[PDB]
Amino acid sequence: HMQALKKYTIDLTERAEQGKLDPVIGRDEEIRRTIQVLQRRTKNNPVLIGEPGVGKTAIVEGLAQRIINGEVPEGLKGRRVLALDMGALVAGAKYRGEFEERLKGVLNDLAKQEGNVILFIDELHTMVGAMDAGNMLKPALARGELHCVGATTLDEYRQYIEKDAALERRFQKVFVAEPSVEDTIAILR
Ligand SMILES: [Mg+2]
């Protein structure tokens, strides 16, 4: 069971449990905000907004680390953070139809783990119009069968999410600015 999740997602909370995630520096406020949005009853899917290379994915890894560390509110305790693996979804698929079938499987598995998994979808706009899985994502989001964190640029969010109420009512912008040079080089060992 949950074959789609094992095949097409990367368990970031597991990577944290294994000590494989780099410490995340200078993002206390963005991680806290991401958590606050996720905890909402409605419009509870945060979308990290920023230019490429600003480190949005690191914020998601930071969220995973905090959960493992228990540095999160009570209801988020024991939650799993899974990143949609686009490379894996496309590997050996060849056709859009096969890709869609695999994505559908992922959503089905998530509908069974409602409230236990947070899915991270990088470059979210590419899944809703920028290969449009909007039809399956919209009801999943509305029914709480999909609780996720997305990442895009402001212009991409405006063009593909903000103009579509079925999507916009479910997402919340969380801005991410470029990190300081100091914090960027701090990751080196
Ligand atoms: Mg980035």
Q: Could you list the beta-strand ranges (E) of the chain.
A: 9-11, 45-49, 80-84, 117-122, 148-152, 171-175
User: Resolution limit in angstroms?
Assistant: 1.8
Experimental method: X-ray
- Cβ contacts of residue 148 below 8 Å, gap of 6+? 45, 118, 119, 120, 121, 141
Binding-site members are 50-57
- Cβ contacts of residue 119 below 8 Å, gap of 6+? 9, 82, 83, 84, 106, 110, 146, 147, 148, 149
d(CA 173, CA 153): 10
Q: Residue 159 C-alpha to ligand 1 middle, in angstroms?
A: 19
Chain centre distance of CA 49: 12
Task: Give one DSSP letter per residue of 130-184, joined into a string.
Answer: ----HHHHHHHHHTTS--EEEEE-HHHHIIIIIT-HHHHTTEEEEE-PPPPHHHH
Q: Residue 127 C-alpha to ligand 1 middle, in angstroms?
A: 17
Binding-site members for ATP are 50-57
Q: Residue 176 C-alpha to ligand 1 middle, in angstroms?
A: 9
Q: Residue 54 C-alpha to ligand 1 middle, in angstroms?
A: 5
d(CA 77, CA 116): 9
Q: Residue 1 C-alpha to ligand 1 middle, in angstroms?
A: 32
Question: Cα dihedral sign for 90, 59, 19, 6?
Answer: negative
Which domains are delineated in the chain?
1-189 (3.40.50.300)
d(CA 140, CA 145): 5
